[PDB]
Write an enzyme that holds these catalytic residues in place. Sequence first.
Site, PDB file in Angstrom:
ATOM      1  N   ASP A 270      80.044  45.956  61.711  1.00  0.00           N
ATOM      2  CA  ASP A 270      79.932  47.345  61.355  1.00  0.00           C
ATOM      3  C   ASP A 270      78.565  47.676  60.751  1.00  0.00           C
ATOM      4  OD1 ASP A 270      81.444  49.872  61.114  1.00  0.00           O
ATOM      5  OD2 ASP A 270      81.065  49.546  58.963  1.00  0.00           O
TER       6      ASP A 270
ATOM      7  N   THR B  41      75.593  54.676  63.646  1.00  0.00           N
ATOM      8  CA  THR B  41      74.601  54.234  62.666  1.00  0.00           C
ATOM      9  C   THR B  41      73.683  53.118  63.155  1.00  0.00           C
ATOM     10  OG1 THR B  41      76.111  54.865  60.869  1.00  0.00           O
ATOM     11  CG2 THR B  41      74.227  53.480  60.334  1.00  0.00           C
ATOM     12  N   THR B  42      74.241  52.130  63.860  1.00  0.00           N
ATOM     13  CA  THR B  42      73.448  51.032  64.413  1.00  0.00           C
ATOM     14  C   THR B  42      72.500  51.606  65.472  1.00  0.00           C
ATOM     15  OG1 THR B  42      75.153  49.369  64.027  1.00  0.00           O
ATOM     16  CG2 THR B  42      73.524  48.885  65.698  1.00  0.00           C
TER      17      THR B  42
ATOM     18  N   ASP C 225      87.505  51.964  63.149  1.00  0.00           N
ATOM     19  CA  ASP C 225      86.452  52.428  64.054  1.00  0.00           C
ATOM     20  C   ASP C 225      87.094  53.059  65.292  1.00  0.00           C
ATOM     21  OD1 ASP C 225      83.795  51.542  63.076  1.00  0.00           O
ATOM     22  OD2 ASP C 225      83.370  51.522  65.247  1.00  0.00           O
TER      23      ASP C 225
END
Lengths: 503, 503, 502, 502
Positions: free
Chosen positions: C43, C76-77, C372
């Site tokens: 995550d 976000t990644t 998620d």
Amino acid sequence: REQGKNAQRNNIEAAKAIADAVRTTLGPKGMDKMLVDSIGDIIISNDGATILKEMDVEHPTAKMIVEVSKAQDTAVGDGTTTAVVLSGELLKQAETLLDQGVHPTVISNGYRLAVNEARKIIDEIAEKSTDDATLRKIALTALSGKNTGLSNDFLADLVVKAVNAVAEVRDGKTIVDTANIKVDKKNGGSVNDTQFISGIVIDKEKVHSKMPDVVKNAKIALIDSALEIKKTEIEAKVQISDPSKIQDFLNQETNTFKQMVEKIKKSGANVVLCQKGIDDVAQHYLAKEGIYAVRRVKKSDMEKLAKATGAKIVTDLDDLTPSVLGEAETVEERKIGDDRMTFVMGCKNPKAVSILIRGGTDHVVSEVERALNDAIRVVAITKEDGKFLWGGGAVEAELAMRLAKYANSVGGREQLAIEAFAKALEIIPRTLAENAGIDPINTLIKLKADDEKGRISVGVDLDNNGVGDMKAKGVVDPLRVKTHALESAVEVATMILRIDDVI
Amino acid sequence: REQGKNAQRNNIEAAKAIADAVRTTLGPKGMDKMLVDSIGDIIISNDGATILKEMDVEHPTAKMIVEVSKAQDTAVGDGTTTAVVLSGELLKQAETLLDQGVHPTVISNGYRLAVNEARKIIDEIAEKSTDDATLRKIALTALSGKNTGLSNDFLADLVVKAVNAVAEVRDGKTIVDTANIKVDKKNGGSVNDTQFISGIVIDKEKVHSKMPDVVKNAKIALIDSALEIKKTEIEAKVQISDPSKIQDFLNQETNTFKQMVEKIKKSGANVVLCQKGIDDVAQHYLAKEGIYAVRRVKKSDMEKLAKATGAKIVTDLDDLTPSVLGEAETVEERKIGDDRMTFVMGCKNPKAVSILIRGGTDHVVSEVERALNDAIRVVAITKEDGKFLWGGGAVEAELAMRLAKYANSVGGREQLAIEAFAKALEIIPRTLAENAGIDPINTLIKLKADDEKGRISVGVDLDNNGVGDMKAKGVVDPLRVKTHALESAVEVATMILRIDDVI
Amino acid sequence: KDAMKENIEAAIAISNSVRSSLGPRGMDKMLVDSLGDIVITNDGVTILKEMDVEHPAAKMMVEVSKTQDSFVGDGTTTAVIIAGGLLQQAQGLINQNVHPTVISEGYRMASEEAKRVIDEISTKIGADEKALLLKMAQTSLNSKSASVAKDKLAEISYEAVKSVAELRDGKYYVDFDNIQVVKKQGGAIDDTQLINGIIVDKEKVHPGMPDVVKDAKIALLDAPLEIKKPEFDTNLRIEDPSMIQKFLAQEENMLREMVDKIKSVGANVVITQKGIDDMAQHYLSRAGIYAVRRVKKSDMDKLAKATGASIVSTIDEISSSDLGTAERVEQVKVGEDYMTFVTGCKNPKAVSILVRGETEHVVDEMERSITDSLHVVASALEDGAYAAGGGATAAEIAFRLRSYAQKIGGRQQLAIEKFADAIEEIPRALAENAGLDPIDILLKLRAEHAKGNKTYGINVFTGEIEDMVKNGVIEPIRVGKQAIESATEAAIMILRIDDVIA
Amino acid sequence: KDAMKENIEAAIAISNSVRSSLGPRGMDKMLVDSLGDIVITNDGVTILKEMDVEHPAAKMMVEVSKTQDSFVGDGTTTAVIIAGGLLQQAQGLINQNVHPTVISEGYRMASEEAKRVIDEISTKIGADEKALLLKMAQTSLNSKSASVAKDKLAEISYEAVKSVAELRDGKYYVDFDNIQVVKKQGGAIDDTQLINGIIVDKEKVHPGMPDVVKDAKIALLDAPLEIKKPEFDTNLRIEDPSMIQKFLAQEENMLREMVDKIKSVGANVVITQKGIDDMAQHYLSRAGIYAVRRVKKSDMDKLAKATGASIVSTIDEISSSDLGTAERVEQVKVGEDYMTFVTGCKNPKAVSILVRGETEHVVDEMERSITDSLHVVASALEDGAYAAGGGATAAEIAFRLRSYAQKIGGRQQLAIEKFADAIEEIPRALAENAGLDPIDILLKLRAEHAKGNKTYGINVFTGEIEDMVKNGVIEPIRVGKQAIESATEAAIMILRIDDVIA
């Protein structure tokens, strides 16, 4: 922080190190480890869960393997050492594949394919039986590499006996609450001195000498509160202006204790087990009235006793009616070893028994208790499932042979991972060979042949010095513990195999 | 290592610091600096070249400004302080332009345009004259801010006198070799005791008491070698087997010295100036024969004496013929101060004179000599060039006014640089104001007006307390020193302005 | 000059510590703190919140790049990877003396055009709802260690969200206070299940309380069951020994009464956020009431929604209108532990997922993974459209920015082309991670999109450029818009800073 | 991975410490050593040889980039700037996983094609010889602090080289042992002059020697004028006091004889590399011979060439065939110092330049600058062609590589395009240095060359793209070939190294 290769080779190395720490505890010829701290001190055990829970592991990756000691479904008997040793081997075997250029994820996929298959094969090959004889063979096997002496058959029998006593049938299925089996120990020597009691044994003496040593046809009151003088919540101060009042105040207290005991007597209770303390004046009047009282009883015991006797745990004595009293034929105090313990027998509910272990040394009675508890668990599980597996590395050998073939029915990369998983399983039969002191390499060669000739039950035999039929020797493993030992190992090996950077 | 702005601002700061170190030596009201070391010790001077040559400059950029002390064409009189102070101002004025965004190279181009113009303007405005009176005014001006006492007019006259004595005419032009003017000093007090000698003065006494105090009509032998016993190059060892030989060997030596002196006498020489030592036995026979000898004479003096007397410096006495002898009317020894010096007068060549400076303190006779030497140089240069310039910042003021206009006739960026160069020139008149203790700002205001009204010769006047006519006061600067002081300043400022990184 | 050189490098460093975790061939990170706490995850939000960044540029990169607006899938990644790209490319442009303000305008514009390309090339979810959402939830699980059980977990994610989703204006609204996610170790990952009700990890407060109550009338309290002491200083004055009894009686009576009120209103179960006095525990027990104490506030809020109870703070003023409803409340043993399951709630759009794993650190990551999936399918259902994964949608945006750059010519154009190269950081990361050849995949990827293949992406399994939607690798439209949104803001912030001072 | 990241950054660092010194708006560097020695220069060969580089990558960059083959104009500074460019661009390509071997092949090829473009676009020097070469020498001086006097120094550079240049096969050959460059402070830079002869910074050994000798017969020796001591151990045995005299006589006679031999052969001047015994100095003086001692070997070699003398080591075997010739040898005072001028030499293709500056560090840089000019015009005369400066020829090569890349498509192509971007480091440096806008000049520069303007470059004075040859900014064809030659070798060497170990 470490990245890539350095991070991975390191993690694998760590996992292997912790597996080595428990390795030699595997089997009938397992060794013990002495764990020493600072204050409490020395612990000597063969139990893998105990060893790991106590160990002072520093490395994070090793702290992760150690977590298997807490997976209640695996941490019973050799389940822990099996899961840890296997994770170590799964990670070790992976290192080779990583070296060749295989991606950690396809390796993880291979292991998933392999373990799912294995879980199927063992339910396929699982042997059914609820035969008390097999139960006994489960216990004998569970008690194998422990420092229990020769009394094993005697202990095994106690176990089956206790298990069958509390085992109950719900809708068609047998459920066994182990919490109904009260196991306790007392340093008196012998071991053969272990007793099976049909009741609850309580490590507590009667509070007052003048109280009866034995009560028959007991109406037992279980009490939550202290039989002591209680002060109000909102602060209270007593003001005496008349010298005469001082006595009266001193008397209200006495009379308060007198009433406490009156209430108890009024309910018909003749035994009072209090979870808390009992004032000396209350003890005075309880003894005067002939009630047998015990104080500061553990909540765990309070609960088991409510379970066994049908008594309702009451806090407000005014709600102490004959309806909340428990029953037992006899409540007797008797000296065990150097202590005096209270025995509550012939309880209203028969599904409650106790095992008072004896054995001397202290450091032996502890492991023996540690042993009897695992044994009780394994026997209980099997009683429920009705199925078991052959021991001595027989299961692993079958699995290793089958998965080696199932690999062929799979695609390139995954196939490699599945052949690696198959090799990893051999770490168990090899560990038993090494521990017994026999040649690992040749035992495996023989073991493979026999299981391939269809001899499913051939495991490692110390006697025959090599392989042998476990069916005859009676070495049996419960199913549930096997499947979870494989599953734990896989889930944890994957977690670790996936890390490429530790910050 | 420093890059860009940091490197440049730093270099400029350094240049300014070293300029400040000599600043106050400028002019008639210049101060002195005391320079102290470890062993030799204290030096007190007003000479800028001396101060900088001695200074212990650390910074590289400052080591570069200091190099102006070695540019022989600039380092005479106030030339050094003028060049250093101007470089400092040129770099300071540049900093402003760098700040605005002007590139160091266009600034360098502006300065080149400016200096080339200035060099033209001064040849245009240069005043011609070979008038001995002007020569005297050059010296008086050169001796202005030194600790020489009031004897200046007396010294100035000596200078002109010496200069005119050795000055010679080649093809139509006057050449003056200053190396023909031998300046020496002796601690006897007075200063007015300085003498002008028509001959070469030598700080050396006659080697032997019995030698004449004075020789008239001297045939002078200049000798390179030692009048001592010479050993062969290839090692030689003497072996005596006859006791009688020892005397003979001891005598060959005596006879060897006797012959040396015979050779000298045979040439007609009656004076022997040896660059090296003279053995005591040789001194014996020289005195015996009446020859006046001096030994260990400096090579510099050997050379000046060969020049003045027409003598050939001979090394092998066998080549000591009357042809190589020099001539002088008188060779006399006379006591000066506490020492006894040899005076060679009435030399064959009249173009050789000496100045024996006196003054007491030692630390004063040194600067006075330091002074007389610069004075001799400036007077010599002018004697040659025949042109000079008005002093007291008059030249700079003219230049500053003209370049300020010439800037307008130039393109944008360069114009800025040329207005900066014009401002920089004002640092000289301002420095003279500050040193004299008068108001810098108002002197400049006045100076500008007068030179703009066409009063080319108006410089800074201490007396009139502000500006005044240098023509009347007689303050004159040689041309050559001016042009080179401007040129040095520009070349060095450009070198430094171009650096953007010091590693 | 330098403050920038340094800020940018600090930032890019964060971008690379996360790069290898992107996608189906992505790896995880082990993060150990000073207190020794360990977190192993994939995550990107946890990794960032976890890592100890010192450099102020890095702290900002982390804060801004956080895609804070929503934590759906790998937004976000993806944001972080693009920010590092945008920054690294800006470095070059600055080496050429392009003013950081031009670059920031260019980025701002390209960012806007990119959101546009996405809306344009997106695809509405049609009669294909169930199949699409499943494929979405699997794609998500595919990146995680949960892949191992992606088909079962995807079904759970779909069933759960579908159960709590309200189809309002013909539109869908998903309220997460209707989804209770709880984790319990001691079971395989496959043992993970969806329970129709609200599970609370707590057990009855007293041993004598019932293990099950059918048709429960639930009292939800926010006050403790104890004696109330006046606010003004108070003292009992005992001058008669006889009052000592009358006083303690009055206290116990106060507690007995509190229980009588709760019980008088019909309450069957009592769940409190605070404590329950030992004597009160006796009384409830005696009245046959199942009570649990010190319950999590978040758990309280979810129980209120599902049972329709109101959280009461004034027991005295409690009423039946306040009571919640459920067909049954029961204590069940989940592994080692005892939990309370409130089943058959009044509000049937209330569900729970019991996440299992053998180990603690395993079960932790499973919950992270499942949470998620829930957000992925829920945001797809809410948005109504989806975009192709596999780097397809990024290769497209890159393709379409190179055009638009030439339309908005000038210096802005250089910033816009650089923005396109940066978006290509995604297909590069994916390729690099799977063990493919970046420069090779990229060239083929550009070809297909030039030839109009909008949905073409990187199949990391076969290592071939294919149709990402056909293969099922698809993501909510929201993940891409936010990621490019967060990414450009993070890069513009660092690009504008020319000095760092204390 | 890292060994490379580090090596490359060490290298680029050298590239940037030299970048600002390129061109008409270039700055100089002050280099101070540990011993405190200072060198302020613009010369890229001196800067590199001077700077204390520690990193092994930097040491190699310096060694290889040195354009060692020749030090004409700014070949080394140009080489270094391009190497840094090539390296910095390779960094990017490697970030994309392009194997360093592809990159090295690409660079090698582009390098070859680039030399080709130069030969092609070059321009032979025609009937314009004098005007061209002058314009070349000025362009060179333009970068230096010598610009200040570029027109006068350029004339000197032209006159000097033209004087010693041999037009052999219709071709020109310039032997630098015919050009004596000497520096003396204490004069303005304008005082720099060309003397037809060989100046030697030394003065007569004895004060009694003549200051001038017309029609000189020069003896050039390589042995000292002293007594010869046997090789075997030797001792004089004196037993008779009378022999002491006879012995010293024999020694002086040996020296007197040596002088007689030199003089017997007609020698007028005696110039030795070694020493002259004091007595020998007396004898030469007495014979009226002008002698100078301890002369520099390099000075000896130049005197031999100009006078046609042979350097003798066996005085005993000296002969008139060995004597050199010159119309006059004379001691003249140059500033403070006394020098010996050998004028009107036998070989008239023998010249000297007396470099002046007021200060030591000024005169040093003037000589550095003039030696550059000499090599520029001489290599132009030798090569026969010239290429336009101002970044024109680099912008062209860049233009022509972008084409060729598409012909040699594939991965090689990426390396070839990157090679073009790197060559553009030159016009960028020039622009940056002059205070122009790089990104702006570059775009216009590309336009002109696309539209066939081969000779278009950066006029840093006007800040406009113009015709560099028209404006006169031109350079020898040799500077560009070597610079791109040295630049690609330096970059390929670092690109191949993946580890540094002790």
